[PDB]
């Protein structure tokens, strides 16, 4: 009954990495569930194969209110083991955009969707800003383990720093801790050892380094995970390796935030920024 959350800047493959991770865990006799906290509801499409899963926020407004909402209408097991929920979000400019996460997470506890057969619960959470309902996993102690999906680019390392700052603030209130870093590779030089440098200074560990591949592009058209498409793919074994280290990861640390210069100096030495 370990619940984890995936935090990172938008566009860093976090939704796909969570889905291929989940597909990698479904085969090995584990029943897991994905909760999509990203406002755009593309975080369960490879599992469900659906064009666009109806979000809890969407169907609550059409059905009057969230009380008139049934769990069997929001929770779809497109894959038999995998359970997929899309929280959804409000329209831009209308209230707090993270309030969709609060409604969905509260709804799932109310209906008891966390009962007796879940091994892992994964939250795919927007990481550009940590506030409102996006900081809700860390603030409410919903997700004990947190993995950050980062990149060589400076904004991704800056995003990883902000999440660690928010984990420190709620370290005393809750058991939530940084479980590790996930480095998703664009075809740039000196990346894996760059993020290892980041992790070594944060007091946390790197978990894996997933490289860019073209097998994922074939999977996109299928609306399927790479694992279910081509289980013999080099990327598909890479995702098994990342999955196996997630289950057998034991150290969970309170992060150490990194200042502006100190993060900057790491970029200059590797040459990513001049």
């Amino acid at each position: 009954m370990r619940q984890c959350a995936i935090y990172g800047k938008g566009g860093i493959g976090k939704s796909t990495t969570t889905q291929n991770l989940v597909a990698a865990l479904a085969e090995m006799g584990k029943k897991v569930m994905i909760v999509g906290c990203d406002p755009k509801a593309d975080s369960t499409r490879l599992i469900l194969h659906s064009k666009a899963q109806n979000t809890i926020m969407e169907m609550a407004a059409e059905a009057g209110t969230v009380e008139d909402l049934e769990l069997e209408d929001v929770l779809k097991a497109g894959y038999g083991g995998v359970k997929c929920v899309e929280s959804g979000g409000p329209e831009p400019g209308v209230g707090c955009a993270g309030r969709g996460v609060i409604t969905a997470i509260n709804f799932l506890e109310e209906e008891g969707a966390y009962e007796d057969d879940l091994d892992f619960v994964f939250y795919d959470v927007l990481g550009d800003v940590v506030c409102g309902g996006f900081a809700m996993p860390i603030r409410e102690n919903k997700a004990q383990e947190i993995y950050i999906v980062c990149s060589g680019e400076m904004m991704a390392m800056y995003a990883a720093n902000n999440i660690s700052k928010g984990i420190v603030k709620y370290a005393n209130s809750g058991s939530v801790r940084l479980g590790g870093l996930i480095c998703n590779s664009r075809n740039t030089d000196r990346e894996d050892e760059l993020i290892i440098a980041l992790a070594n200074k944060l007091g946390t560990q790197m978990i894996h380094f997933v490289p860019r591949d073209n097998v994922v592009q074939r999977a996109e058209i299928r609306r399927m995970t790479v694992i279910e498409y081509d289980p013999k793919a080099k990327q598909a074994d890479e995702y098994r390796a990342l999955a196996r280290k997630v289950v057998d990861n034991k150290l969970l640390v309170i992060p150490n935030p990194i200042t502006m210069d100190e993060l900057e100096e790491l970029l200059m030495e590797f040459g990513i920024m001049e």
Partner: protein
Amino acid sequence: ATIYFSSPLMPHNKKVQAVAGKRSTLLGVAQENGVKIPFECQDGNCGSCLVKITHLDGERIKGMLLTDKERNVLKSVGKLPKSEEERAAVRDLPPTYRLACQTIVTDEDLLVEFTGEPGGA
């Protein structure tokens, strides 16, 4: 009815006189007096007008109705404890946090606090 508006965005707390029970809500009184509570919808679902209300005359607290729409929005924002929900359902007593666009002014003295941020931090 006397209403005291308070906000860190406001250099000074503002004191206004309001007619109780108007069809126009607390949002009416605020807009007529230039109090900048963020209003971002016309259907009462966004929750951006969340305010903290304190009844200064505790003897003169008036029973009211917490509608199902306001209640659900307060849960979605998170500003509704289970005890306050039971208090409203059984004793018809207002909760600490309210939506200004759905709050009817009563004949008492009120302190209204807002941060300038939408409900839900």
